[PDB]
Write a protein that binds this ligand. Structure first.
Ligand code: CL
Lengths: 251, 75
């Protein structure tokens, strides 16, 4: 319903809760909250087996509203964060740029992440090895790309028409929204032991890098009983993905 | 009638609809046979975005018309 199961794991020698997800549940909220649990910035009592969206909001509120600044820029951000909280549960709008694993159109939505010090990533990157594609896509965000593709379809100008077709096949071939280059850059760009949020295919995940390896936190309700299953390889682009325990050992 | 929906992966799904059908019905049909949520759907035809309230005859969509679907990014 509107309840989420709590799962306890041995994280860095401590009993730590993480929250498991429905089928199409509240994954941004979850991606964020699970980071906060893993950092012990939010604590649940030992016997918590279930938690509600409202409680999560309350714990989240305690984080956001307890943050102190490095004046007026700061307070604006915080309300933009507050205003967005409901969308954290029902679906959040992102608009990636294909130039880099941190490149999004900056919106209020993104600001929550920034206030909590939580990096936000995607791996939907145009291959630098193909200059035609790099030129066509340029610095355009996804939303601009689909508009441009449309404009170009209506032109009979060869340049525009060519630009569009290249952009189209970029979107067609990379529709999984993760590329080998994105994967490599994620690898090199993410820092060891940092917890972050990874966008892909309209899902937000809790991500970390450990010994140069990238993992997504397993929140699937199916594995609620299996303590040994905590981390899943961010394995690209498709194929068998290995599971690890809390300590990043094969489970 | 039979129409075509072009998924970005390249696959072209075929759909059976009626000109009186609403855009909200068609997204529900694409979901019902491709699993993509109707909210994550944006329908494009002749360089126009289709709106959930209107019907197919409102855009003069005829048999074997190819509708373009764009995913909006919402996790
Ligand atoms: Cl961290």
């Amino acid at each position: 319903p509107d309840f989420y199961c709590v799962k306890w794991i041995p994280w860095k020698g401590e009993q730590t809760p993480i929250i498991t997800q429905s089928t199409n549940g509240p994954c941004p909220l979850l991606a964020i909250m699970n980071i906060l649990f893993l950092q012990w910035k939010v604590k649940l009592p030992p016997q918590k087996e279930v938690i509600t969206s409202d409680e999560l909001m309350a714990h989240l509120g305690n984080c956001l509203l307890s943050i102190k600044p490095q004046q007026l820029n700061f307070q604006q951000n915080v309300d933009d964060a507050m205003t967005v909280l409901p969308k954290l549960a029902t679906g959040l709008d992102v608009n990636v740029r294909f130039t880099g694993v941190s490149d999004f159109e900056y919106t209020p939505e993104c600001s929550v992440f920034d206030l909590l010090g939580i990096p936000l990533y995607h791996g939907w990157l145009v291959d630098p090895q193909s200059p035609e594609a790099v030129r066509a896509v340029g610095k355009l965000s996804y939303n601009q790309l689909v508009e441009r593709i449309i404009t170009c379809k209506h032109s009979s100008d060869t340049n525009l028409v060519t630009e569009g077709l290249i952009a189209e096949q970029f979107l067609e071939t990379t529709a999984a929204q993760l590329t080998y280059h994105g994967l490599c850059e994620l690898t090199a760009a993410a820092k060891e032991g940092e917890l972050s949020v990874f966008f892909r295919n309209n899902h937000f995940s809790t991500m970390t890098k450990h010994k140069s390896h990238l993992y997504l936190l397993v929140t699937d309700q199916g594995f609620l009983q299996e303590e040994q299953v905590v981390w899943e390889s961010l394995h690209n682009v498709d194929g068998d993905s290995c599971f690890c325990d809390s300590d990043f050992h094969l489970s | 009638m039979q129409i075509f929906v072009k998924t970005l992966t390249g696959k072209t799904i075929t759909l059976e609809v009626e000109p009186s059908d609403t855009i909200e019905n068609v997204k529900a049909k694409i979901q019902d046979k491709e699993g993509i949520p109707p909210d994550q759907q944006r329908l494009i035809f002749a360089g126009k975005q289709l709106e959930d309230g209107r019907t197919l005859s409102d855009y003069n969509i005829q048999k074997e018309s190819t509708l373009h679907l764009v995913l909006r990014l919402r996790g």
